[PDB]
Design a binder for this molecule. Structure first.
Ligand code: MG
Lengths: 136, 152
C-alpha cells in the first residue's frame, strides 16, 4: 500500500519540478490545477497527503482547505455547493505551499485549516522534512 | 578541442552565473535531479520556462499598451513569472518581478512600463546564459566527453 499523494498547483513549471523531486523521493502523485479539481479528486479517492498551493485561479487553496474541513466535519459538500463549486473521522494532512507575500503567512494557512506549510521554491530537503513527519 | 579544458571552462562559466546573481541555489536543485533516470531534465524544465514566459511577456506587453490598464489582468502575469523564475533559480528575473508587483499594487502605470522593460532585460540575459550552458554541455557529450553529475 504505497501512500497516495495529491499535488494541487496551477503553475506548470512548479508541477514539473515537484514531480521530479517526489519521484526521486520514491513517490508518484495525482495532479489537480485548482481547488475545484482538488475537491473532485478528494471526493473520489482517499489520499494520505495533499500538497496545496495557496494562490490559484477558480478556487484558491485557502478556501479549498476550508471546504474540505467542512466536509470532514459534516460528512457533506454543502459548504462547497453554496460557494458555487460543482460536485458530482480521518483528517487529511494538508500542507500549504506559500509564495512569500503578505497574503500567504503561515498563520493564515493555519487559520484556513492547513496543518503545515512549505515555503516556495520547493526543494528536496523541504519535501523530505515534510514527508518524514506526515507519511508513514 | 581540449575536453579537459572545455569541462573546466564549463564549471567556471557556471560559477560566474552564480557570482553574478543570474542563478541562485534553486538552479542547483534542478541539476541535482538530472541523472541516468532523468537525463535531459534541466533543459526540459528550462525550455518549458521559456515557452511559458515568452507567452506571459507578450500578454503583459499587450495589457500595458491598452488605453485603460486593467491591473487585475496584469498582476496574475507578473505573479506567474515570479513563481516560475523562483522555481528555476532565475534570481534577477524573480527580483525584478517582486519590484513590478509593488508598482502593480500602487496602480502606477509609468513605473510598470519601466518594470516590464527591466524584467525583459533580465529574462533575455538568463535565456542567453542558459541556452549557452546547454550548448557547451552538448558539445562535450557529442565529443565523447561527459558532464560530471552535480552530487551536491
Ligand atoms: Mg499558484
Amino acid at each position: 500500500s504505497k501512500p497516495k499523494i495529491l499535488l494541487v498547483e496551477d503553475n506548470k513549471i512548479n508541477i514539473m519540478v515537484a514531480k521530479s523531486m517526489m519521484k526521486q523521493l520514491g513517490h508518484t502523485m495525482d495532479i489537480a490545477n485548482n481547488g475545484v479539481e482538488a475537491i473532485t479528486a478528494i471526493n473520489s479517492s482517499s489520499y494520505d497527503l495533499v500538497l496545496m498551493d495557496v494562490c490559484m485561479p477558480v478556487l484558491d487553496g485557502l478556501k479549498a482547505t476550508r471546504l474540505i474541513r467542512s466536509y470532514e466535519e459534516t460528512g457533506n459538500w454543502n459548504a462547497a455547493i453554496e460557494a458555487g463549486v460543482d460536485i458530482s473521522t480521518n483528517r487529511l494532512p494538508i500542507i500549504a505551499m506559500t509564495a512569500n507575500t503578505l497574503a500567504e503567512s503561515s498563520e493564515e494557512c493555519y487559520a484556513n485549516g492547513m496543518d503545515s506549510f512549505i515555503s516556495k521554491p520547493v526543494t528536496l530537503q523541504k519535501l523530505r522534512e515534510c514527508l518524514q513527519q506526515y507519511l508513514h | 578541442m581540449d575536453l579537459v579544458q572545455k569541462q573546466k571552462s564549463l564549471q567556471d562559466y557556471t560559477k560566474s552565473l552564480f557570482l553574478e546573481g543570474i542563478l541562485d541555489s534553486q538552479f542547483l536543485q534542478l541539476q541535482q535531479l538530472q541523472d541516468e533516470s532523468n537525463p535531459d531534465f534541466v533543459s526540459q524544465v528550462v525550455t518549458l520556462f521559456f515557452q511559458d514566459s515568452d507567452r506571459i511577456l507578450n500578454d503583459l506587453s499587450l495589457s500595458l499598451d491598452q488605453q485603460v490598464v486593467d491591473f487585475k489582468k496584469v498582476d496574475p502575469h507578473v505573479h506567474q513569472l515570479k513563481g516560475s523564475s523562483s522555481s528555476i533559480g532565475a534570481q534577477r528575473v524573480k527580483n525584478a518581478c517582486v519590484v513590478f508587483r509593488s508598482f502593480c499594487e500602487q496602480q502606477n502605470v509609468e513605473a510598470c512600463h519601466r518594470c516590464l522593460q527591466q524584467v525583459k532585460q533580465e529574462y533575455y540575459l538568463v535565456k542567453n546564459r542558459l541556452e549557452t550552458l546547454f550548448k557547451l554541455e552538448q558539445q562535450i557529450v557529442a565529443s565523447g566527453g561527459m558532464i560530471p553529475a552535480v552530487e551536491l
